[PDB]
Each structure stands twice: as C-alpha cells, then as structure tokens.
Amino acid sequence: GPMGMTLHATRGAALLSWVNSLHVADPVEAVLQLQDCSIFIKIIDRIHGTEEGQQILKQPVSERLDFVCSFLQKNRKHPSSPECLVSAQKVLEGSELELAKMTMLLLYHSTMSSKSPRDWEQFEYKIQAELAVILKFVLDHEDGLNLNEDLENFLQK
Ligand SMILES: [Cl-]
Numbered sequence: 001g002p003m004g005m006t007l008h009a010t011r012g013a014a015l016l017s018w019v020n021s022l023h024v025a026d027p028v029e030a031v032l033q034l035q036d037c038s039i040f041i042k043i044i045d046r047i048h049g050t051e052e053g054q055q056i057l058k059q060p061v062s063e064r065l066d067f068v069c070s071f072l073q074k075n076r077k078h079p080s081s082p083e084c085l086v087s088a089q090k091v092l093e094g095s096e097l098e099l100a101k102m103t104m105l106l107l108y109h110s111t112m113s114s115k116s117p118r119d120w121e122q123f124e125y126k127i128q129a130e131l132a133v134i135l136k137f138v139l140d141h142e143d144g145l146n147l148n149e150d151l152e153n154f155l156q157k
Contacts, residue, residue, distance in 0.1 A: 007031065007097045008157035014130035015103045017123055022046065022110075031096040034103060037064035043106045044071050047113045065091055072105050077143045085148060100155050108138045 012031050019034070020027050024042035034040060041053035041064060056067045069086050076085060085105060090098040111118070120128055141150050 004095070005097055005152045005156045007100045007155055010126075010130050011134070011155050011157060012096065012100055014123075014127050014134060015100055015107070017127045018107055018118075018131060019043075019103060021118070021122060031099045031103070032094060034099045035091065035094065036061055037068050040064075040068045040102060040106060043110065044068065046115065047106075047109055049114070062088070062092065068102065072102070072109075075109055078145075081145070083148050085151075097152065097155060101151055104134060104138075104151070104155070107134065108142060111135065111138075 016028060016031060019039060022043065024046060025039050028034065028039070038057060041056055045051060045053035053067075056064055059067075065088050069084070069088050072085050073079065086102055087095070087098055091102070120131065123131065137151075137154050141147055141154075144150060
C-alpha cells in the first residue's frame with residue numbers, strides 16, 4: 001500500500017509529556033509504550049473517579065483496546081458519526097500515529113473532566129506551546145465531520 005501518515009516528533013513529545021505529568025505510571029519515552037492500553041485505562045479511571053479499569057487490566061491487549069475505543073466512541077460529541085475516531089487494527093499493528101490520536105482525545109476528555117485544572121506552567125515552554133496548539137485544534141475541530149482526516153493532518157505537521 002501507499003505509505004501511511006506519520007506522527008511529528010513535537011506532537012508526540014508534548015503528548016508524552018502530558019501523559020507523564022498525570023503520574024498514573026512510571027515514565028514513558030515513546031508513544032509505542034502506550035500500545036498495551038494500561039496507561040489509557042488508568043487515564044479513563046482518573047476521568048471517571050471509578051475503578052472499572054482495574055477489572056479490564058486483567059484482559060488481553062485487544063480487549064483493553066476495545067474498552068478504550070468504546071470509551072472514546074461513547075464520549076464523542078456526535079456518537080452517531082459513521083467514521084470511528086480510532087482504528088483498533090492500526091493500534092495492534094503498532095501505529096504510533098493512531099496511539100497519538102488516542103492520547104490527544106484522552107487529553108480532551110481529561111480537560112473536560114471534574115479534575116482540577118492542570119498546572120500548564122509545569123512544562124518546558126516548548127511543550128506548553130505545543131499543548132496550546134493541540135488544545136486549540138480540539139477547540140476548533142473536535143465537533144466536525146472530517147475530524148479523522150483533520151486530526152491526522154494535524155499530527156503529521
Ligand atoms: Cl489534563
């Protein structure tokens with residue numbers, strides 16, 4: 001097939017910095033380290049204030065992944081859209097780009113949650129700048145109908 005779109009280093013670096021700032025796990029340094037969905041489950045648990053995730057951590061990666069993709073589908077602004085936001089297939093094939101889309105959407109849902117506002121000042125300015133751009137993209141597009149294409153173009157930079 002034609003070559004896929006790629007994740008820009010600055011976009012991945014900011015998303016990883018955000019993930020690490022949640023302290024739901026030991027540090028991660030590459031987006032592929034999110035593939036096992038463990039951190040993603042912990043992030044959803046943090047959003048809910050519940051422990052449902054703890055039961056799903058016992059399941060295999062494909063089941064963990066379905067759980068996360070289901071959360072993202074359930075919580076989108078138009079649950080009735082035909083294109084799903086995330087390809088479970090591409091995640092199982094090791095797509096950092098698809099894992100970054102997951103992480104970005106969980107950033108969105110975290111910022112809309114009951115948790116206290118993040119201290120954005122904790123990040124290096126380069127990272128603050130990228131996070132600002134990421135959250136502006138969410139503001140400007142998350143409720144659109146070409147979101148999937150738009151998000152991929154954004155993440156490739
Ligand atoms: Cl946050």
